[PDB]
């Protein structure tokens, strides 16, 4: 039996709200092991959140979450949980579960799950073309005003990957996210080759395909 | 110091990272490697013990209060972010961490400017995008000019992760105005200064033209 940790739950929650993450274990017994929650805000370092040692009945918490978060474990379901209450904007992060080893070193990790805390409403992006002009031409799509993360962007249904740069989202002052995806191609191909960006926004269940053409005069 | 430090290195280089988790002598210390979009991987535990399966070029050491991770010879797969962890009797602290990036020859950016689409102008806003493509080093300066007035505060930048193929970065700067404000001005330009550019490059357009 191979060891692994599968996380469930997560998503969008408003400030002051409550949310529970799950960490289903297999390949080892959670009742004779330690489970730890570690989070990572976008572009930031790792931050320890909580730890549980079911055998001894000890739980430990970071000061930043103390009295708001609760770590627990269901022996029969071989699953650990992180109950997150009184959420704040600064709790926005990817949340990882991990198994403990000597010295609380963490040897096996879950896949991570994104938790977004914000008052902004779920919203699909508007997709606008970044039209090429005049060697090498550049074109793209502006994926504007969507919420929450993430969006996936591909080109020609995955057929075009070489030269593609999809930029990290930027959080605007409106509370909405926005990004651009660009691709460099040969100028000669602009007349012949058709270019479509495929934007997919699971949280709003919206899917948009936009053909990027060289603007007409 | 909430974000990881940066370090530029070449393949074959020796690297020593010092742990800054505000630790003590008692601390049990661990080291991790993290790559973008992936969970961290355990490298070292108990200060100096090599974790099962981890290459021998990784080593950990303790000298008094100072905990250290050394990579004796950097390999292509080793370019990533590294974190130390310090466990006390009731607390775990991760350090700031160091992001090791690939050293490379200087490469000037290809610069492109994109006026707002008619589709966006209909919706009531106007975004002007300036693209800096495939350059090195990361440090670039992108300044916006509208009718010869230098701008600040109405644009946001975004930078890609170092490219796996050619070790270059790409950057976008997006000037955002209302439709009304966009219509008030004629000439839009982004000026790019960069190490691989002997002089600053300006790409510009006039609103309304081919």
């Amino acid at each position: 039996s191979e060891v692994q940790l599968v996380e469930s739950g997560g998503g969008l929650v408003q400030p002051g709200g409550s949310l529970r993450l799950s960490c289903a274990a297999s390949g080892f017994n959670v009742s004779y092991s330690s489970i730890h929650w570690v989070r990572q805000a976008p572009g930031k370092g790792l931050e320890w959140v909580a730890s549980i040692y079911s055998y001894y009945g000890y739980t430990y918490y970071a000061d930043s979450v103390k009295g708001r978060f609760t770590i627990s474990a269901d022996t029969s379901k071989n699953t650990a949980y992180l109950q997150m209450n009184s959420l704040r904007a600064e709790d926005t992060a990817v949340y990882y579960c991990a198994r403990g080893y000597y010295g609380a070193a963490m040897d096996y990790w879950g896949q991570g799950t994104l938790v977004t805390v914000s008052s902004a409403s779920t919203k699909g992006p508007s997709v606008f073309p970044l039209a090429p002009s005049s060697g090498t031409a550049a074109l793209g799509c502006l994926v504007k005003d969507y919420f929450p993360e993430p969006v996936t962007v591909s080109w020609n249904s995955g057929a075009l990957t070489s030269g593609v740069h999809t930029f990290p989202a930027v959080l605007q002052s409106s509370g909405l996210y926005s990004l651009s995806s660009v691709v460099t191609v040969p100028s000669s191909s602009l007349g012949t080759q058709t270019y479509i960006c495929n934007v997919n926004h699971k949280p709003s269940n919206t899917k948009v395909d936009k053909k990027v053409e060289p603007k007409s005069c | 110091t909430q974000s990881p430090s940066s370090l530029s290195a070449s393949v074959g280089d020796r690297v020593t990272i010092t742990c800054r988790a505000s630790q003590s002598v008692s601390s049990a210390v661990a080291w991790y490697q993290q790559k973008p979009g992936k969970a961290p991987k355990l490298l070292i535990y108990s200060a100096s013990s090599l974790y099962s399966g981890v290459p021998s070029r990784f080593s950990g050491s303790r000298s008094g209060t100072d905990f250290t991770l050394t990579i004796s010879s950097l390999q292509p797969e080793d370019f990533a972010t590294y974190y130390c962890q310090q466990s006390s009797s009731s607390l775990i602290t991760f350090g700031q961490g160091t992001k090791v990036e690939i050293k490379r020859t200087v490469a000037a950016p290809s610069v492109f400017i994109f006026p707002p689409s008619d589709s966006q102008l209909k919706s009531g806003t106007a975004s002007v995008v300036c693209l800096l493509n495939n350059f090195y080093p990361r440090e670039a300066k992108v300044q916006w000019k509208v009718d010869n007035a230098l701008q600040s505060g109405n644009s946001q930048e975004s930078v890609t992760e170092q490219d796996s193929k050619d070790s270059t970065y790409s950057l976008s700067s997006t000037l955002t105005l209302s439709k009304a404000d966009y219509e008030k001005h004629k000439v839009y330009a982004c000026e790019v200064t960069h190490q691989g550019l002997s002089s600053p490059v300006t790409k510009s357009f006039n609103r309304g033209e081919c």
Binding site: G103, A104, A105 | -
Partner: peptide, 12 residues
């Protein structure tokens, strides 16, 4: 104490 519990569990 947190830092010493995993050693004890691995011995069981």
């Amino acid at each position: 104490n947190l830092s010493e519990l995993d050693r004890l569990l691995l011995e069981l």
